[PDB]
Amino acid sequence: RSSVQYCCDGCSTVPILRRRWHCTVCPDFDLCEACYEVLDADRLPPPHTRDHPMTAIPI
Amino acid sequence: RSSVQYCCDGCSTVPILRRRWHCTVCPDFDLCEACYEVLDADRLPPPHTRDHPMTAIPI
Ligand code: NI
Ligand code: NI
Ligand SMILES: [Zn+2]
Ligand SMILES: [Zn+2]
Ligand SMILES: [Zn+2]
Ligand SMILES: [Zn+2]
């Protein structure tokens, strides 16, 4: 079956499991826990920027 | 990001990797390689039946 899943925009892991750090500003941007913790601020995929508020959403 | 992935109707693994055994008759039915090889038809969710032709589709 076809299933909607969240894929990390930092590392392309899919599905993100347990929780996803979601951008409140971008249209459709999510990070897994590891990317949220380790991705460098100047290496975020544009147009996401480091000032965008992120929220932890249960999967 | 939101992403369409294939989820196995036999074991619920998602994404199916490599290839998916896809039902030609049902609306949206897929098995991973492992389920296709070892699950008996009585274990598969109605309305899928053993006479439905299945085709291997690369992921
Ligand atoms: Ni949102
Ligand atoms: Ni089809
Ligand atoms: Zn990631
Ligand atoms: Zn953003
Ligand atoms: Zn399976
Ligand atoms: Zn079927």
Author numbering:
A (entry chain B), B (entry chain A): 2611 to 2669
Which passages does the manuscript contain on this structure?
We turned to Arabidopsis thaliana UBR4 (also known as BIG), which diverged from metazoan UBR4 early in eukaryotic evolution and has distinct roles in hormone signaling. Instead, an internal ZZ domain is found in AtUBR4 itself. To explore whether the plant ZZ domain displays distinct specificity to HsKCMF1-ZZ we determined the co-crystal structure of the AtUBR4-ZZ in complex with an NRS containing peptide. We observed multiple differences in the substrate binding pocket, for example a specific interaction of the peptide’s R1 residue with a serine residue in the ZZ motif, whereas the corresponding residue in HsKCMF1 ZZ is a leucine. In agreement with this, ITC showed that the AtUBR4 ZZ domain binds to NRA and NRR peptide sequences, whereas HsKCMF1 ZZ domain did not. Thus, the AtUBR4 complex could act as a traditional type 1 N-degron receptor, consistent with in vivo studies.
